[PDB]
Write a protein that binds this ligand. Structure first.
Ligand SMILES: Nc1nc2c(ncn2[C@@H]2O[C@H](COP(=O)(O)OP(=O)(O)OP(=O)(O)O)[C@@H](O)[C@H]2O)c(=O)[nH]1
Ligand SMILES: Nc1ncnc2c1ncn2[C@@H]1O[C@H](COP(=O)(O)OP(=O)(O)CP(=O)(O)O)[C@@H](O)[C@H]1O
Ligand SMILES: Nc1nc2c(ncn2[C@@H]2O[C@H](COP(=O)(O)OP(=O)(O)O)[C@@H](O)[C@H]2O)c(=O)[nH]1
Ligand SMILES: COc1cccc(C(=O)Nc2ccccc2F)c1
Ligand SMILES: COc1cccc(C(=O)Nc2ccccc2F)c1
Ligand SMILES: [Ca+2]
Ligand SMILES: [Ca+2]
Ligand SMILES: [Ca+2]
Ligand SMILES: [Mg+2]
Ligand SMILES: [Mg+2]
Ligand SMILES: [Mg+2]
Lengths: 349, 425, 438, 54
């Protein structure tokens, strides 16, 4: 009989994983403070990694990689890409970004302006987006910097993709969410099902003030958009429809045009930080579910937007993905008494 | 040289004590005359813990036999190992205590107590470094209960910084001599709450059910019951009587088993308990499962009705200490709902290479569980059913006691029950 | 030459001390009877080994050591052991009843009555020294003597020897080899009162030593003898600079200068490699790069923790055997480009390297295999703070219920000393977090 | 990657490599604590004897 604890009551993902574990009749849930556990569904912030793997006779496993926040923070990701030789400052799949500290607090203010002035002088598109871990889109550096000083937390200014791929009909923006599971052996599994979070509003390049056609967040569309759910239920197009669209419209497939780049980006990001977070020779074991967010431009080039360390899932895909977590992440360490739903991204460890 | 002084009082106390000295004398190779005839140096390594060494390489138990009537100790002096005890260590009267706590504690017992303390003082003065005392007695009678607790009180006054432990037999309607046993037991329990460091609760109800159901003994006798007590007392004292990586005296063991001063009443247990399939080898998993099984417990309390504050498990015989840890860690990590989570690593395991006589291996269980409250509730309720009618009180008021002393012992034990309940939640 | 006096307190200190002096004699060619043929100066000398051994007119080399325990059974082993002839009775101090795993009993009740006798014996050793450097103190955290008496002794040593350094070798409690539930109490009480009296303390977690014995030596259930022989190898690697000719860590003061820029943060992490089983058919000898790389694997640290998620303040590499500087530097470069080694901004990013050409000595019949080269890395990481957090958490669980507190108050300790010690530990954890924050 | 302070002897050598530059209670007081705890033990024991005398 395996034992697990639940220390994040707000995780819809691991609320289902916990529901499945108990259904097997072979897992027993303990009080959240009981140290005699096999599996910890830990809290998002300040998870006590230092107390894991010190119980005699208990193989212990946790659903978070210590140090993965370097990848899952706006400013952290930018610093990692620019400082890691594996990714390099010339990384071709990440928008030009800069870490800007508000003046009321290194900082990349001058470096950003140097690149900004170059675009302004070269007649090139000079639209940037400011965001932090509350978004502003503007073509004037004065507005961007002033908007950050009014705040009191670190922000990132990256180049705004002015040529996004637009779905038809609708002429509308979108982003692609990919769920990736890294197990204790640091195998990189890509869930075969992705979701496009589409904007139900026509993309308008002459007005960044109304951010409803520029921000594809599921919460902004369902709150400030007047066409929510028009083209697809819940502004969520899945891969079968999107692949069928790419064939009819662009005479290409989702695998060739987009997925190859997505898998490449995932491997590059996760292989980069493997020496820092691998638990291969550690006294405890880690696995974690990531949510990668990508943007596609009109040239069918994929851009990494951010990486989410505690992602939610599309309602339709909770059952399949959560079961897949129990199969390759939990039961692989604690076996029970297909056609896998994941795509193994082979790599060198 | 960490000497222990043994005191046995009353009928039950002397009959269980006699068997205890019979069992451990066999394990240490001491014959009925006190001469050594073993084949292992482990037998004599810690012999001075329970035995004094006299002329001619004779070993004499450091035991004091106390009773208010001669019959039981006449039987001891004529029993198997009767000649091994020091003749001067028999202290007895003629009046008897009539199963009356007041007679043992206030009248008959008071006339004899000073002569008992003289012998106790004599045994203590000859100890290089006395650990403490152990008393065997019942709580349902008069001498072991009344005079036994009186002796504890005067031993604590004279040796206030020495450990005081008891093996205490609790009365049960299923194995009873008189109806006043709940009275005598309730009066004693308060004395133990105050003046003992560890008390092993041996419940005659549990001893009976084990003999009738597990051992398949049609009509259990006091002898059959005392076989279980002997085996249990040998298991709890094994680690002090033999060498090993465990270097523990009575105080160290108390410091790691008693988190609160009044909650020092333990549930003992033993395995195996086989009926006459008696030659079959008993695996470590079987030893562990049974040792934690309620049917192997001797307090007649369900461990699943409370929580373990602390647990000590002693394994005896040649066995895989790796497989021991695996099975122990298995029982904890498979039932961690019955272990308080605010005492980390509260399940300790100890091993001893010398097994009991006639057994390849065995295990002794020592639990400090809040379930023990069910034992004190049972006694408390039997006390109140009679005391609410003042039934049989004249036996006690005739010895100078007042009804107020009963009311206070009633409240003291209900306080004890209430204390266990708060730590169980 | 300047002398060092070793003090062994409690069962852990005494049994580890016995294993070290056994190893010391084998390393210096001293026989169990105390004779040392290679020592051509009979009855004296100021050689390096003389820091740990005095000499009698008859040529006996006597350890500069005192053993203290409140019960005699453990120290009786030394009196009748293989090296009984090394020591004289004035060096072995035993009581009659121990502290019962009770800090208050060792520090107050019993410590008060034996402290003056222990100082007198230490004074007799000090009177033999022309330039005493200070003391090395071995003890457990969990025992009543190792915790309670040590802290009292350290307080007095700071009074009677104000200008002397004091280093510690402390055994951190691990449930796999402990039968005591109160050791978190004792560990935190002794750390609080000893913190300002110790210039540098090397913690060894029994959990780590236990797992190295099972994993690398193939011992299914390690004993105290297995654990102590491995620990004495680590200890020997740390004190070798004091006992052999050299220029790194040549006196106790240099341990603080090289490993402890901040006084309260004085707990360096020890990592040792290689540990190879003697029962093996025959092992491939590891290179300088491989054993150096092994110093950054958590599996051979004396305390399980993740240095990838802390900051370094200092780092020493102590090599023994066939090692030349060329290969050390080449290995260090390889490890920087691969490992996560972040120093604090107010400390240089570098390594102090010491090389002793004599390879590790292995006790005949022991569990360790003879290797051609070995290394012990001493690094002051903030990651060792994981060990305090674990210990403080177990403390908090029991103290919230006052479980076992009456045992301590019964020996005359005030309950406020629990909270006073706990608050000091909280400030210690905060000091680590302030040094290793990004 | 600079090496400094190379020292060599017959039994070994030592050096330093830099990869990157940077960016008590008196005796009187100890007796009072010990005696204070002793006094608390005495008081607690006297209360026990008083209890037993009653
Ligand atoms: N590594 C190692 N640890 C030991 C050894 N002996 C005891 N320990 C550890 O020390 C702790 C117990 O403290 P002890 O040193 O035995 O007790 P003490 O210092 O003698 O103090 P007392 O309570 O008076 O006996 C436990 O964590 C043991 O695991 C040993 O020989 N080697
Ligand atoms: N450089 C850029 N160019 C174009 N669009 C961008 C962009 N950066 C962000 N966006 C848009 O903003 C939306 C969300 O931005 P971002 O991901 O930074 O906020 P967020 O992290 O709170 C949402 P989530 O974490 O769920 O992906 C995306 O759907 C994307 O369409
Ligand atoms: N287990 C056991 N219980 C006994 C024995 N003799 C008496 N008792 C119990 O002890 C109680 C009677 O007390 P007893 O010892 O005979 O009175 P005392 O001689 O005045 O101390 C009753 O609960 C009996 O069931 C015995 O040999 N074994
Ligand atoms: C209505 O039932 C009752 C009423 C009063 C007492 C008892 C009882 O259980 N008595 C007893 C218990 C243990 C030993 C000896 C005993 F006499 C039962
Ligand atoms: C009279 O009571 C006694 C007498 C002798 C020993 C003990 C005891 O508590 N021993 C023990 C406890 C836990 C683990 C191992 C042990 F050996 C109690
Ligand atoms: Ca009379
Ligand atoms: Ca000499
Ligand atoms: Ca000082
Ligand atoms: Mg996000
Ligand atoms: Mg009778
Ligand atoms: Mg000891």
């Amino acid at each position: 009989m395996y034992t697990f604890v639940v220390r994040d009551e707000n995780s819809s993902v691991y609320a289902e994983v916990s529901r499945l574990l108990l259904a097997t009749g072979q897992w027993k849930r303990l009080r959240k403070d009981n140290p005699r556990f096999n599996l910890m569904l830990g809290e998002r912030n300040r998870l006590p990694f230092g107390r894991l793997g010190h119980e005699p006779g208990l193989v212990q496993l946790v659903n978070y990689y210590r140090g993965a926040d370097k990848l899952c923070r706006k400013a952290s990701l930018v610093k990692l890409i620019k400082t890691s030789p594996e990714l390099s400052e010339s990384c071709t799949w990440f928008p030009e970004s800069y870490v800007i500290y508000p003046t009321n607090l290194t900082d990349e203010r001058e470096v950003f302006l140097a690149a900004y002035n170059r675009r302004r002088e070269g007649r090139e598109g000079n639209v940037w987006i400011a965001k932090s871990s509350g978004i502003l889109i503007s073509s004037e550096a004065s507005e961007l910097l002033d908007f950050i000083d009014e705040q009191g937390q670190v922000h990132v200014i990256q180049k705004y993709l002015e040529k996004p791929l637009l779905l038809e009909p609708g002429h509308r923006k979108f982003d692609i969410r990919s769920w990736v599971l890294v197990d204790h052996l640091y195998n990189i599994y890509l869930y075969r099902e992705g979701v496009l979070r589409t904007s139900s509003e026509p993309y308008n390049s002459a007005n960044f003030q109304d951010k409803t056609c520029h921000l594809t967040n599921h919460c902004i569309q369902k709150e400030y958009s007047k066409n929510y759910g028009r083209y697809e239920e819940g502004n969520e197009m899945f891969f079968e429809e999107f692949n069928q669209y790419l064939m009819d419209a662009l005479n290409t497939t989702l695998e060739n045009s987009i997925l190859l780049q997505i898998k490449h980006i995932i491997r590059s990001c996760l292989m980069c930080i493997e020496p820092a977070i691998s638990t291969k020779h550690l006294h405890y074991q880690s696995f974690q579910l990531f949510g990668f967010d990508f943007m596609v431009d009109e040239e069918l080039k994929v851009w990494l937007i951010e990486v989410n360390g505690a992602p939610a899932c599309a309602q339709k895909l909770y059952a399949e993905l959560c079961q897949g977590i129990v199969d390759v992440a939990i039961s692989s360490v604690f076996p029970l008494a297909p056609t896998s739903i994941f795509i193994k991204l082979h790599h060198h460890h | 040289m960490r000497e222990i002084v043994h005191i046995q009082a009353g009928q039950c106390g002397n009959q269980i004590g006699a068997k205890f000295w019979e069992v451990i004398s066999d394990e240490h190779g001491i014959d009925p005359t006190g001469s050594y005839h073993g084949d292992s140096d482990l037998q004599l390594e810690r012999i001075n813990v329970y035995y004094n060494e006299a002329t001619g390489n004779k070993y004499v138990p450091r035991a004091i036999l106390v009773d208010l009537e001669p019959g039981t100790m006449d039987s001891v002096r004529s029993g198997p190992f009767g000649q091994i005890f020091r003749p001067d260590n028999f202290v007895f009267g003629q009046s008897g205590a009539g199963n009356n706590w007041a007679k043992g504690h206030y009248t008959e017992g008071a006339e004899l107590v000073d002569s008992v303390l003289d012998v106790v003082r004599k045994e203590s003065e000859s100890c290089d470094c006395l650990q403490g005392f152990q008393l065997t007695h019942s709580l349902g009678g008069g001498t072991g209960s009344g005079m036994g607790t009186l002796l504890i009180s005067k031993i604590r006054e004279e040796y206030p910084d020495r450990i005081m432990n008891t093996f205490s037999v609790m009365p049960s309607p299923k194995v009873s001599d008189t109806v006043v046993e709940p009275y005598n037991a309730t009066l004693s329990v308060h004395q133990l709450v105050e003046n003992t460091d560890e008390t092993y609760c041996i419940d005659n109800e549990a001893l009976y059910d084990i003999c009738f159901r597990t051992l398949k003994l049609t009509t259990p006798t006091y002898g059959d019951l005392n076989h279980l007590v002997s085996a249990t007392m040998s298991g709890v004292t094994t680690c002090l009587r033999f060498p090993g990586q465990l270097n523990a005296d009575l105080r160290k063991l108390a410091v790691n088993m008693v988190p609160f001063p009044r909650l020092h009443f333990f549930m003992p247990g033993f395995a195996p308990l086989t009926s006459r399939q008696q030659y079959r080898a008993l695996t470590v998993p079987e030893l562990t499962q049974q040792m934690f099984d309620s049917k192997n417990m001797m307090a007649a309390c369900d461990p699943r009705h409370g929580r373990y504050l602390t647990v000590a498990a002693i394994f005896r015989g040649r066995m895989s200490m790796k497989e021991v840890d695996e099975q122990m860690l298995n029982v904890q990590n498979k039932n961690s709902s019955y272990f308080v989570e605010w005492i980390p690593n509260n399940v300790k395991t100890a091993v001893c290479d010398i097994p009991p006589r006639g057994l390849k291996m065995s295990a002794t269980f020592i639990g400090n569980s809040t379930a023990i409250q069910e034992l004190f509730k049972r006694i408390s309720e039997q006390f109140t059913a009679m005391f609410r009618r003042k039934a049989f009180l004249h036996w006690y008021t005739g010895e100078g006691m007042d009804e107020m002393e009963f009311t206070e012992a009633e409240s003291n034990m209900n306080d004890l029950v209430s204390e266990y309940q708060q730590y169980q939640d | 030459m300047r002398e060092c006096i070793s003090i062994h307190v409690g069962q852990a200190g005494v049994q580890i001390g016995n294993a070290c002096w056994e190893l010391y004699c084998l390393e210096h060619g001293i026989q169990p009877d105390g004779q040392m043929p290679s020592d051509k100066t009979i009855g004296g000398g100021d050689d390096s080994f003389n820091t740990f051994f005095s000499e009698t007119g008859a040529g006996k080399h006597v350890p500069r050591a005192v053993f203290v325990d409140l019960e005699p059974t453990v120290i009786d082993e030394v009196r009748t052991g293989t090296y009984r002839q090394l020591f004289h009775p004035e060096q072995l101090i035993t009581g009659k009843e121990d502290a019962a795993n009770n800090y208050a009993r060792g520090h107050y009740t019993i410590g008060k009555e034996i402290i003056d006798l222990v100082l007198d014996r230490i004074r007799k050793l000090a009177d033999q020294c022309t330039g005493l450097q200070g003391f090395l103190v071995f003890h457990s955290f969990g025992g009543g003597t190792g915790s309670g008496f040590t802290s009292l002794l350290m307080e007095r040593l700071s009074v009677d020897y104000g200008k002397k350094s004091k280093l510690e070798f402390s055994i951190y409690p691990a449930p796999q080899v402990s039968t005591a539930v109160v050791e978190p109490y004792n560990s935190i009480l002794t750390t609080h009162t000893t913190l300002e009296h110790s210039d540098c303390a090397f913690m060894v977690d029994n959990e780590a030593i236990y797992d190295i014995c099972r994993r690398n030596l193939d011992i299914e259930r390690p004993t105290y003898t297995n654990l102590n022989r491995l620990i004495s190898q680590i200890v020997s690697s740390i004190t070798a600079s004091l006992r052999f000719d050299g220029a790194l860590n040549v006196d106790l003061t240099e341990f603080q200068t090289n490993l402890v820029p901040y006084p309260r943060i004085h707990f360096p992490l020890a990592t040792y490699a290689p540990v190879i089983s003697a029962e093996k058919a025959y092992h491939e000898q590891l290179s300088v790069a491989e054993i150096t790389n092994a110093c950054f694997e958590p599996a051979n640290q004396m305390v399980k923790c993740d240095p990838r998620h802390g900051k370094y303040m200092a780092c020493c590499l102590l090599y023994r055997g066939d090692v030349v500087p060329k290969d050390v530097n080449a290995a260090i470069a390889t490890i920087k480009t691969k490992r996560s080694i972040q120093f604090v901004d107010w400390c240089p990013t570098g390594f102090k390297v010491g090389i002793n050409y004599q390879p590790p000595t292995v006790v005949p019949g022991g569990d360790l295999a003879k290797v051609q080269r070995a290394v012990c890395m001493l690094s002051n990481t903030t990651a060792i703070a994981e060990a305090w957090a674990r210990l403080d958490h177990k403390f908090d669980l029991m103290y919230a219920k006052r479980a076992f507190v009456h045992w301590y108050v019964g020996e005359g300790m005030e309950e406020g000393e629990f909270s006073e010690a706990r608050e000091d530990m909280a400030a210690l954890e905060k000091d680590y977090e302030e040094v290793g924050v990004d | 990657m600079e090496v400094i302070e190379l020292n060599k002897c017959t039994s070994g050598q030592s050096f330093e490599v830099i990869l990157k530059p940077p960016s008590d209670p008196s005796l009187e007081e100890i007796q009072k604590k010990l005696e204070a705890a002793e006094e608390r033990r005495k008081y607690q024991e006297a209360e026990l004897l008083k209890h037993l005398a009653e």
